[PDB]
Design a protein around this ligand. Structure first.
Ligand SMILES: Nc1nc2c(ncn2[C@@H]2O[C@H](COP(=O)(O)OP(=O)(O)NP(=O)(O)O)[C@@H](O)[C@H]2O)c(=O)[nH]1
Ligand SMILES: [Mg+2]
Ligand SMILES: [Zn+2]
Length: 397
């Protein structure tokens, strides 16, 4: 029960310090681990153990207090989430809000607030309703007291009326590890572990799938992912949707598959039960041939008879983005016949617009997806030679 309890998204404009701050909190100064990153949504996890020193009472993420040297006491393990680049981060938030429990918005003190990407990240948090926010006013050592206060006022102006209006603004130097203890304390006070109902039907979004048996006992396929509801236990019988692809009359169909959990890895150790928070590795009895090479990435795991429906096509209530991040801002209306890229949970599929409606579109999916009515779907359009997020859609019945 010491695995990560909450996922904290790291957001903020490019180079404002997200990665440096993550490293300051996790204690990583070497190293790669990029091999476990998602491939649909490029999400990565970095765990840290929050501890409190009995002597000076200050918080840190190390077994030994950085301030007095005394041994600290375990408080809680958390996981910090990231994605490579602005677009990947925006897509992650819009498609996988269920994967975040809070966020640290990193704002550089030596640049006017808010920068373009800073505005869009807050916009995404606003859209998904994520209010457990902490603001890290980074690179504070690079500015004088006057400019630091001015930057502070700009941040206050910026967050007023938003989901971050009640967020603490913590001046720090992620690079030099200055005032980090105050930030760690803020994580405890502003991003508390939610009161989750461990008895709701389990649901895990698969991020990756492998065959962990050496090149060449032969162990079953492994599924790595995020539990977003309920819990998983060794011995549990589980169903995976959409499932295994097969051909019928020259077309591709998917068959949900059932298996059993043999092992569970979470927080760097094998456990008998896993929960929301951090990455969870699920050992199954599945033939490794079915999980090898991420064949099940994007699938959903649950208990038999308690999984969301599978869709071959989606009816979406569409909400186009009011973006500010090279011209090409004005988002052109979605047209019938257009092929868009959709991200829902950890699933990714191209979609053909087959019909238009009032603030709604009908899309035929290249690959079926497992999702619930009401779930949010990130919508991207290929502009030139790359995919750009243009909005999001809500699955309708
Ligand atoms: N002087 C100073 N430089 C800092 C501080 N924090 C980060 N930097 C520097 O700012 C640069 C970018 O930091 P980085 O953590 O990579 O930023 P990021 O937000 O993760 N970048 P990206 O959005 O591209 O992933 C690096 O050169 C880093 O060392 C700080 O407190 N002081
Ligand atoms: Mg970074
Ligand atoms: Zn101490």
């Amino acid at each position: 029960s010491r695995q990560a309890e909450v996922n904290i998204g790291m957001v903020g404009h490019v180079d404002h310090g997200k990665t440096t701050l993550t490293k300051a909190l996790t204690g990583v100064w070497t190293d790669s681990e990029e091999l476990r990153r998602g491939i649909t949504i490029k999400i990565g996890f970095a765990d840290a153990e929050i501890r409190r020193c009995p002597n000076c009472g200050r918080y840190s993420t190390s077994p030994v207090c950085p301030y007095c040297g005394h041994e600290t006491e375990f408080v809680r393990r958390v996981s910090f989430i990231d994605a490579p680049g602005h677009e990947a981060l925006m897509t992650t938030m819009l498609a996988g809000a269920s994967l975040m429990d809070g966020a640290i918005l990193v704002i550089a003190a030596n640049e006017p607030c808010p920068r373009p990407q800073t505005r869009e990240h807050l916009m995404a948090l606003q859209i998904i309703g994520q209010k457990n926010i902490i603001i890290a006013q980074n690179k504070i050592e690079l500015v004088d007291k006057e400019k630091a206060l001015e930057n502070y006022r700009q941040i206050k102006e910026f967050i007023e009326g938003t989901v971050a209006e009640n967020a603490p603004i913590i001046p720090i130097s992620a690079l030099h590890g200055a005032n980090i203890d105050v930030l760690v304390k803020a994580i405890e006070d502003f991003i508390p572990t939610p009161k989750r109902d461990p008895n709701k039907p389990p649901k895990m979004l698969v991020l990756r799938s492998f065959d962990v048996n050496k090149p060449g006992k032969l162990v079953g396929g492994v599924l790595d992912g995020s539990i977003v509801q309920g819990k998983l236990k060794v011995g549990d019988e589980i169903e995976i949707r959409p499932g295994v692809p097969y051909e019928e009359h020259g077309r591709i169909k998917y068959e949900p598959i059932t298996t059993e959990i043999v092992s569970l890895q979470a927080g760097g150790q094998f456990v008998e039960e896993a929960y929301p928070g951090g990455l969870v590795g699920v050992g199954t009895k599945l033939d490794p041939y079915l999980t090898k090479g991420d064949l099940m990435a994007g699938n959903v795991v649950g208990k038999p008879g308690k999984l969301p429906p599978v869709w071959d096509s989606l009816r979406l209530e569409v909400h186009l983005l009011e973006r500010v991040v090279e011209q090409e801002l004005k988002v052109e209306p979605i047209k019938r016949k257009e092929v868009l890229l959709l991200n829902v949970g950890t699933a990714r599929t191209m979609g053909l617009v087959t019909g238009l409606g009032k603030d709604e579109i009908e899309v035929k999916l290249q690959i079926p997806v497992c999702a619930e009515p009401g779930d949010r779907v990130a919508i991207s359009r290929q502009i030139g030679s790359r995919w750009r997020l243009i909005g999001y859609g809500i699955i309708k019945e």
